[PDB]
Amino acid sequence: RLTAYERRKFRVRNRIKRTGRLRLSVFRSLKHIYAQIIDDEKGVTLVSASSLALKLKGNKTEVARQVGRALAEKALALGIKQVAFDRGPYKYHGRVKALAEGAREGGLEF
Amino acid sequence: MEYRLKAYYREGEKPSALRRAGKLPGVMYNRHLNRKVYVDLVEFDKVFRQASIHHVIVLELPDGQSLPTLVRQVNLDKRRRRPEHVDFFVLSDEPVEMYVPLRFVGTPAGVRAGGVLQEIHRDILVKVSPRNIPEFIEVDVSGLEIGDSLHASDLKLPPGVELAVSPEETIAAVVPPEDV
Amino acid sequence: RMKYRKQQRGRLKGATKGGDYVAFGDYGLVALEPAWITAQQIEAARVAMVRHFRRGGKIFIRIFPDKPYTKKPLEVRMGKGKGNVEGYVAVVKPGRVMFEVAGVTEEQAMEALRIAGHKLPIKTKIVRRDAYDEAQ
RNA sequence: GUAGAGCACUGAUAGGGCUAGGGGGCCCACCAGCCUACCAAACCCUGUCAAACUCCGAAGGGUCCCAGGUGGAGCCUGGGAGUGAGGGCGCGAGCGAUAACGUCCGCGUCCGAGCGCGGGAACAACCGAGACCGCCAGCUAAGGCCCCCAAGUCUGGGCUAAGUGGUAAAGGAUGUGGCGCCGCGAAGACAGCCAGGAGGUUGGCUUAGAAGCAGCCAUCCUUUAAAGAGUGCGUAAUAGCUCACUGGUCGAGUGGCGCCGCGCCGAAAAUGAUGCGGGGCUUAAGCCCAGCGCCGAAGCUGCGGGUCUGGGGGAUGACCC
RNA sequence: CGCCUCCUAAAAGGUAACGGAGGCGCCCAAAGGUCCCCUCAGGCGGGACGGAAAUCCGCCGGAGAGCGCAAGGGUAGAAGG
RNA sequence: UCGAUCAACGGAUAAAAGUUACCCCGGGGAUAACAGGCUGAUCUCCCCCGAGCGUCCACAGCGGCGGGGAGGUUUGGCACCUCGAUGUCGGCUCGUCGCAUCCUGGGGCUGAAGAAGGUCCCAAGGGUUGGGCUGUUCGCCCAUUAAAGCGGCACGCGAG
RNA sequence: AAUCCCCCGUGCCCAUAGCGGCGUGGAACCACCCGUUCCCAUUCCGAACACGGAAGUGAAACGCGCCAGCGCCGAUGGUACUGGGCGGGCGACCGCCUGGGAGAGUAGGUCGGUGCGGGGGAU
Q1: Among B51, B76, B117, whose Cβ lies nearest the Cβ of C103?
Q2: DSSP category for residue A50
Q3: Using CA atoms, how far apart are residues B13 and A72, in angstroms rounded to an integer?
Q4: How many CB pairs below 8 A link B and C?
Q5: Where are the beta strands (DSSP E) in chain A?
Q6: N or C: which end of chain B has fewer CB within 10 A?
Q7: Is residue C21 within 8 Å of residue C88, measured between CB atoms?
Q8: B51 — alpha (psi -120 to 50), left (phi > 0) or beta?
């Protein structure tokens, strides 16, 4: 109970204290995956990442990197101009490393 | 049988005055509909006293609305006895909370036995029985010694069945005078 | 007496009221105007009763050897750490539910108490079961 | 977060149901049996405690802003300082023996340091009350009014009668009076009365005797005054006795346990005696509830004066509010 | 006869007592940083050298094990591994 | 930035123990010792209950266990009178009150025959010896005696 | 575009968002799932974390709805307490006036209500 749930509530509360204003919530797994943006629980939630517009379920952590960069610019302008970070159900090397670089260009803008 | 005289005013000052005349506070209650009616002791008591009245409800007269009720609570008086507030519930039709008067006969093997006598622990039963419980729910045996004891299990349940109590836990047991 | 394997040395002093009442057999001895009562005196009653009752069928209990009373020194001059443990007993003050059985069936039990407490140490009263009691 | 409170946190602990640990031992090599004899982690139920346990939780106290908010304090700067040990009373914890006109701390008042008046006999701190100075003025506190001494030996309704007033507990009692209650078969009551106190009532042991009136229990029947499995004076059983019954006698109310308020026993002293004293017990008393009334403080009002302080007219005064 | 902790300070805070209790006058070179992971004792049931109690499997659990050192606070949404 | 139980820890110095019945100067009953005071520890006396002894009989004689007061003695608690002053013991001499009265009597009770004891309530009236040893009052011992009490008053007495 | 509805996330409210019992969905969710050279990973195993994808299934994690047995919530009354003023008692202590007035103790109460992004569910 408290165990895995905590895996969760932990990345949670820590992430939370963190405060540079916004955080995107990526989400691991295939069709599962998708990342939405949030700030202070003001109540609001900027823009939504990638509606399952499938591009290559293949060996594509790139299906990923793509949906990512996508969301990257999506928000980039979606919501004028800002800076912060996000969640992640894991380290940045696969699926998540991916949403990362996606965001990465999102800000990089080149 | 029962009845009473109500309290328009209630809480403290009033119940106290009551006491003063010889009246103790009374709660008339029925499934979430509540009214403070007040207690004329003397009689009140004779009544209560019946005790058969406390175990197996009775009818009360208030205004003129003859209704069915029992005590579900009572504040009987610290510094002595008598009370501080008498509590009754009038029933609709599903009486589950029943501490029906219980009698059992431990026909000899007890004190005429090894001196040992029988200790009555339960003597009554808080089981279930909607608008249907006798003035006497009962059971029996013929052993009261060795290191003998019996309870809610052995029990032996009659008509309006339903054990809201527990899988046995000591209706009674026998202890020695200076042993057996 | 019995207040065995305590835990501390001593209490303090006050008194005023508590929570003794019920019944527990129908042979009852209830205090009324006391305070602490010697675990001993206590045993006294215990005896009194026990013996009277054709000397067998058990009585029950009531209060306990509760606290540790200290007259400290022996008779010195005062300033000890107030140390010294010495007399252990009950702390019952508002007419308390003191419960004693046996199977006397009568004013026989009566007597038993009569003396037990007449003895013991205070203004007190006795009876039986008078207004049951419902728990959860 | 103490009082309370509750028990699930920990620790107690009392009667209980289930349970193992020793079990007492040895079959004492495969060494497995009853017992429950077991200590019960326990067990739930029945149970009550804890300043240094608490799942609940106040009674106030703490404090920030808005508002009351002038007595008159409130603030900051400043020179002249005295105590640096004190006690008493009430409440709350220590302690001490839950002793001391003890000593520890705290909230309050206190008393000194004003606390000089009343006062309770007289008594630094217990209830009343703040004295700037007058009055051969009147209203009042507390607490008082037979007298000693101001003030009704008021009225009204009770309850004690011991002198309680005029110090005391444990506890004892057909005290006194009061309940809120029990016996009334005028099928005329209880103590007083009359007579019978009935035949199987005749061992059960012991019968030396039970053949109720010698010890180990008997708990039945007939039978009428209604019936003593005989409550009692007793020896050798036995024999005789009062009603426990009328039965008749009488009849018309009787013997009670709980809860009450007012007294007595218990409670023996040292120069001599004592509610202050005289005194007083159906106003004179005293306890309780009722209502009226007058007394009595430097306390409060009315003739006036002194005095300082804010302001008021400041002419020097001054006067007045 | 210096300091920390708990009670009594009586609920703000805060106070004696020859009042209750009980510790410290070390260190930890890495219990000092941060990043990434993990996550108790104990109850039960099943198991090699066991064999009240290791080691492993299987469930259960306001977290009462835990944090050099005493208490108390905290606190595994870990300060804990 | 180092030396430091200065650990009686705010720490005078670096560097310190005693003893005075041989003693001596300052103030306070803001601290003892005498006694007094209040408390009563208490001890003494009394009062409840009865397990229980008294062959039989609870209580004639007795009380387990536990309990409840009186009094101011004994061993103590405190600090205000007292330290500009209160002589503490033992004894003497003259004693004065007190009763839980020892001898006295009046008594009910007996496990009272008589006699004699012993068991309580009433009542201080007078009375309530000599020596021994011990500074000791207490005490133990000799001889009687109706009897040869307990104690209040700084444990009366130094202006005797 | 901007209606409620199915939801996948992801937010305030601390146990009526709990345990557990019966059910039930994958079409689309999403989970387990397949396999592992490649990111990157287990002091053992890609167990987890992870990479690498058709499938198979919906067992398992899983979301609503019915079920209150345990647990959680836990009023009306009612007493204790007591803030303050007065009495009654030598007494430890009792009681009277005026506001506040938990606990436990039958009620009866619940098996969450909702913040926002959104695949989208109903021209």
Answers
A1: B117
A2: -
A3: 73
A4: 40
A5: 23-25, 36-38, 85-86
A6: N
A7: no
A8: left
